[PDB]
Design a protein around this nucleic acid. Structure first.
Ligand SMILES: [Mg+2]
Ligand SMILES: [Mg+2]
Ligand SMILES: [Mg+2]
Ligand SMILES: [Mg+2]
Ligand SMILES: [Mg+2]
Ligand SMILES: [Mg+2]
Ligand SMILES: [Mg+2]
Ligand SMILES: [Mg+2]
Ligand SMILES: [Mg+2]
Ligand SMILES: [Mg+2]
Ligand SMILES: [Mg+2]
Ligand SMILES: [Mg+2]
Ligand SMILES: [Mg+2]
Ligand SMILES: [Mg+2]
Ligand SMILES: [Zn+2]
Lengths: 68, 134, 71, 38, 29, 143, 220, 155, 64
RNA sequence: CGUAAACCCCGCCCCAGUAGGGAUCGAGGGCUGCAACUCGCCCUCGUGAACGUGGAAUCCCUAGUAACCGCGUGUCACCAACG
RNA sequence: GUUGCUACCCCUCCCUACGGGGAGGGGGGCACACUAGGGGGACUGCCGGCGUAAGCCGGAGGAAGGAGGGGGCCACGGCAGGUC
RNA sequence: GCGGCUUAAUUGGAAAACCUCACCCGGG
């Protein structure tokens, strides 16, 4: 259970879904999976620290990650 | 008029640039491709628009900028005013130092105000009204 | 041969400014020579809203009405 | 060494152009300038 | 209060000028 | 892992267990954000930790801290310092706080001071004006 | 057609009889012949404006950062010199609590361009130009009084006005989509521009232009 | 190699980590959890290492603007606040003085700061520590940004 | 400069006719001659008079 | 007086009357002054109302202008949501 | 060039990828910038068009182009205007 | 800020605790 606030069955789902996209945002993840955007931030940053994602555009609030 | 040679031989040129209330004095000498505003390197400047505005003349003059050191002293006028003043000083100093007309032509077709400066300054606040409102 | 990117719009060249018109004078009657399409060589006077110069190319959804009073 | 033109001292007095505030707020500027050399 | 006439209304203490803001306009020069 | 506790009762309040500890303790009627942050830093609990995943002993420590902050914080950090009846430094939570606040207004009314008469009349007691905004399109007293 | 000469910095690209005109010099490079990249990332070279009238007023002159100082508004038709991306930046300074925040607008536009490029695989400048071409209205209605009732009547829109209307519609659609909800302004602007480029009817700009054109067709 | 040759954020983070780990004179006081860093601030600082981060910032500012002193530092760490009623227009509030003064005294005890008649200036030990941390940051900075090599290790 | 008032044209004609040979169709020589020849304590009025004399010299050469 | 704010950067918050909003009120600590209750100003802790962009109507503004941001200053023992 | 500016130098401290760099004091200078008094500059001046000609439109050049931009000075007579 | 209402007075016109102050009560 990485990120204790999120269930593993949802985290692995977000993990498999993100590789199918061309560009992902914490807002899009929050809207698609019914979760707070602050939780979507940690969900995306965990994958970035993994190496599944690369940050390609930063800003206050919205972040842009590319799957690779 | 805005560029004054200082030493020659080891050629040194001191250029001036202005915008609103920002005054930039630039010293260009035959060194490496470095450039420093107020003792800070150009590629560590925190405000991104100001940094890019300062470095547009360097981008336009590709390898000529790689043969001279540029030391800039900018004072007053706010961050965009200082960036524009430093940009004007760098462009004028580059043209004066290298004595190039092709570079000046490029600078004027890129931005005609780069070497001509900015005449417009501000407008005062008159009594009986919230601001100038002109 | 083709100028207008759209399909329902023909092109029209501003050849001559005729003069202002409309309520408050925000319309300018202008000589427009038809570009590509039916009436390819026609010359109309049209009402154009907004600033216009000589040489401006405008899009005509229709090329029948001449229609310039805007009283 | 020589005559140095020190920056001049301004004296602004802004007054209301009305004995009682009847009408458009018109303001009168009065200036006293003092130039200094050394 | 003032200098040329005691009014006390628009006292004026700018610098060292003691005038009623209406005497000043007549004596300003 | 451990499922988050949705409701955590600390200091007679069902604080959200999905919120951070400091920003969840502030829901208590005597604890604000500053008091919650001070309590967390004094007790060594992370102020930005999820309240629903905290351990039970830390929950009891938090509850005792909310009930007895006057033992922890300085005198200048409490909502009842230099108590106008007992003379002690106190931090009142919830209902005792509300009763303590009410029994000052009641004392004003049963002395018939200016503030007491204004409280009886339901008007603003601090120096203000009523030819104006004045009349509330809201509710004045919220404590 | 002209007899008044022409200012320099303008260019004529005569095809057949029609004198196509561009107010800005597309061909610009550094001293070494290298290209100039928008934001250091996007090139100004492959961009093609498909509208002949709109080609005159879209300044596709290469600039690293689209920041003119606010010096092209004194003269009539001075907006033809302002870069189109800087026009997009300038139309982001609303409402009144964002006036003058050009750095914030620049950051928003840069993030939107990155999002557009990574979601479409196309040039962000090209997608923005296509959005403008699909959003610009070619008809308008004007007030008319028949004796007390202000009616309407169809008129044509000059290319400058078409460009202004399309830009305002895109920016206001992004702002309305971003207000009072978790969606960020950069993502709202990105989806608005991509929908405008695709001519999807969901977008605010396409809805606004369709409404205006249907009203004009009704009140010819 | 110099303070101006490295980014301020990375330098301040490295200095704060170093002072927290190796400098024991810099210690938060007993009133640290109960206060904000100024008069009219709405919430206390979130980062628990805020005392060490403030000390690192104070050291960098004391290198750059050496002879300042406590009041000039308070103006340096001021902010925009709501002084008085909260429905009035905002003003500028100087940061709190006790935090700044105690941090300067702690740094003087640690040996990185000394006093003059014009303010607290960094000692040679303080300048050495700041420049050493700057060079350590710049060594890794150059590896990702090759353009900065001309400012640190010229050919 | 939009329209030259009465005193401008009056001074222009008097200086042009008192000394018909000291003015030709250049502005610099005209400004120099009017500064030499008239009590002109204002640069703007002097410049306007010089330009107006230039235009008279143009029209007087055009008429023949 | 004086290292202005907006601004930039990093982290937390995630659409909810809320980590928005700061009215009202409780306890306390100071400043000016001869004096602070009617009737001053500042600070700490707590308390968290209306309000989710506002009908008819209506005002100002063409470029370094509008708008936003702060700073100095006038009145001033103290106090500016005003000029 | 009693003040204000720092190109040029030297003394010290610090860093050093070892080339060099940065900061402070001192000297030198008035170069740059700034400060203040006087002067120049822009006048529809040139060109294309139009017009009897007052003059208007476009363009160049120009720091500045159409009264360059802001303000002051407030005609004769009124408002039974406001101010004992 | 003005109007109105209330008032011993809430002052008179078209940066307020004293003073200001011109209003009311009481007194010199
Ligand atoms: Mg202004
Ligand atoms: Mg009050
Ligand atoms: Mg909301
Ligand atoms: Mg100082
Ligand atoms: Mg405000
Ligand atoms: Mg101040
Ligand atoms: Mg709430
Ligand atoms: Mg009290
Ligand atoms: Mg009181
Ligand atoms: Mg509070
Ligand atoms: Mg409601
Ligand atoms: Mg409103
Ligand atoms: Mg004063
Ligand atoms: Mg009294
Ligand atoms: Zn008087």
């Amino acid at each position: 259970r990485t990120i204790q606030t999120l269930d593993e069955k949802v985290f692995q789902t977000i993990a498999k879904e993100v590789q199918s996209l061309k560009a992902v945002t914490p807002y899009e993840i929050a809207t698609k999976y019914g979760i707070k955007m602050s939780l979507a931030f940690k969900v995306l940053r965990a994958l970035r620290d993994r190496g599944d994602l690369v940050l390609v555009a930063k800003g206050h609030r919205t972040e842009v990650y590319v799957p690779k | 008029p805005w560029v004054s040679i200082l030493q020659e031989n080891p050629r040194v040129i001191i250029s001036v640039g202005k915008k609103k209330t920002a005054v930039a004095r630039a010293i260009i000498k035959p060194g490496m491709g470095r450039v420093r505003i107020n003792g800070y390197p150009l590629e560590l400047w925190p405000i991104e628009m100001a940094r890019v505005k300062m470095q547009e003349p360097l981008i336009l003059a590709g390898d000529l900028a790689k043969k001279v050191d540029i030391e800039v002293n900018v004072r007053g006028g706010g961050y965009m005013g200082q960036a524009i003043a430093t940009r004007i000083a760098i462009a004028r100093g580059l043209v004066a130092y290298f004595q190039s007309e092709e570079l000046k032509k490029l600078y004027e077709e890129y931005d005609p105000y780069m070497l001509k400066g900015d005449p417009r300054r501000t407008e005062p606040k008159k009594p009986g009204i919230k601001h100038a409102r002109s | 041969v083709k100028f207008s990117p759209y399909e329902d719009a023909v092109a029209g060249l501003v050849v001559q400014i005729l003069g202002r018109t409309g309520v408050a004078g925000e319309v300018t009657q202008v000589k427009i020579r038809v570009l590509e399409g039916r009436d390819k060589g026609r010359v109309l006077t049209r009402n154009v809203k907004g600033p216009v110069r000589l040489g401006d190319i405008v899009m005509l959804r229709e090329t029948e009405r001449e229609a310039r009073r805007i009283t | 060494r020589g005559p140095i033109p020190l920056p001049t001292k301004r004296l602004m007095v802004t007054v209301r152009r009305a004995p009682s505030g009847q009408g458009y707020h018109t303001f009168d500027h009065w200036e006293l300038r003092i130039s200094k050399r050394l | 209060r003032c200098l040329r006439c005691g009014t006390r209304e628009a006292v004026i203490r700018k610098y060292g000028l003691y005038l009623c803001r209406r005497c000043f306009r007549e004596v300003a020069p | 892992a451990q499922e988050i506790r949705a409701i955590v009762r600390i200091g007679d309040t069902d604080l959200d267990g999905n919120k951070t500890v400091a920003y969840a303790l502030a829901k208590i009627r005597g604890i604000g954000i500053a008091t919650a942050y001070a309590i967390c830093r004094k007790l060594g609990i992370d102020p930005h930790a999820t309240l629903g995943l905290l351990p039970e002993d830390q929950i009891n420590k938090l509850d005792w801290a909310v009930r007895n902050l006057h033992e922890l914080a300085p005198a200048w950090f409490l909502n009842r310092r230099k108590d106008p009846e007992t003379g002690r430094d106190l931090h009142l939570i919830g209902s005792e706080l509300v009763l303590a606040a009410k029994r000052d207004v009641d004392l004003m009314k049963k002395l018939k001071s200016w503030k007491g008469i204004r409280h009886s009349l339901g008007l603003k007691v601090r120096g203000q004006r009523t030819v104006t905004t004045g009349r509330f399109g809201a509710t004045a007293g919220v404590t | 057609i002209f007899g008044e000469q022409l200012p320099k910095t303008s260019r004529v690209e005569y095809i057949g009889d029609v004198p196509i005109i561009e107010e800005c010099p597309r061909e610009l490079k550094t001293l070494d012949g290298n290209p100039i990249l928008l934001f250091g990332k996007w090139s100004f070279e492959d961009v093609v404006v498909r509208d002949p009238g709109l080609r005159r007023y879209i300044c596709l002159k290469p600039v690293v950062l689209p920041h003119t100082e606010g010096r092209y508004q004194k003269r009539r038709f001075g907006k033809a010199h302002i870069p189109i991306v800087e026009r997009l930046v300038n139309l982001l300074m609303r409402p009144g609590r964002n006036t003058g925040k050009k750095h914030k607008a620049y950051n928003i536009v840069k993030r939107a361009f990155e999002i557009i490029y990574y979601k479409t695989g196309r040039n962000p400048i090209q997608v923005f130009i296509d959005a403008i071409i699909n959003t610009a209205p070619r008809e308008e209605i004007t007030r008319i009084i028949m004796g007390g009732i202000a009616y309407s009547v169809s008129v044509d829109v000059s290319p400058q006005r078409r460009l202004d209307l399309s830009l305002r519609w895109i920016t206001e659609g992004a702002r309305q989509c971003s207000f009072n909800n978790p969606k960020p302004i950069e993502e709202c602007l990105a989806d608005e521009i991509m929908a405008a480029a695709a001519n999807d009817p969901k977008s605010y700009a396409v809805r606004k232009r369709e409404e205006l054109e249907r009203i004009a067709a009704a009140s010819r | 190699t110099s303070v101006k040759d490295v980014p301020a954020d990375l330098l301040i983070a490295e200095l704060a980590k170093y002072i927290k780990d190796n400098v024991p004179q810099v210690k938060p006081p007993v009133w640290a959890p109960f206060v904000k860093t100024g008069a009219n601030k709405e919430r206390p600082p979130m980062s628990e290492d805020w005392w060490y981060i403030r000390a690192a910032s104070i050291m960098r500012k004391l290198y750059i603007y050496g002879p300042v002193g406590v009041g000039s530092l308070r103006t340096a760490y001021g902010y925009r606040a709501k002084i008085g009623d909260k429905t009035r227009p905002e003003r500028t509030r100087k940061a709190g003085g006790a935090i700044i003064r105690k941090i300067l005294q702690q740094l003087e005890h640690a040996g990185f700061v000394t006093k003059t008649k014009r303010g607290r200036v960094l000692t040679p030990e303080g300048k050495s520590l700041v420049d050493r941390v700057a060079a350590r940051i710049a060594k890794e900075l150059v590896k990702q940004r090759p353009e900065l090599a001309k400012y640190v290790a010229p050919p | 400069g939009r329209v030259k008032p009465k005193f401008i044209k009056s001074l222009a004609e008097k200086l042009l006719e008192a000394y018909p040979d000291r003015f030709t169709e250049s502005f610099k020589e005209n400004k120099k001659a009017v500064a030499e020849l008239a009590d002109i304590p204002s640069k703007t009025v002097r410049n306007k008079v010089a330009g107006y004399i230039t235009r008279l010299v143009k029209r007087q050469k055009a008429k023949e």
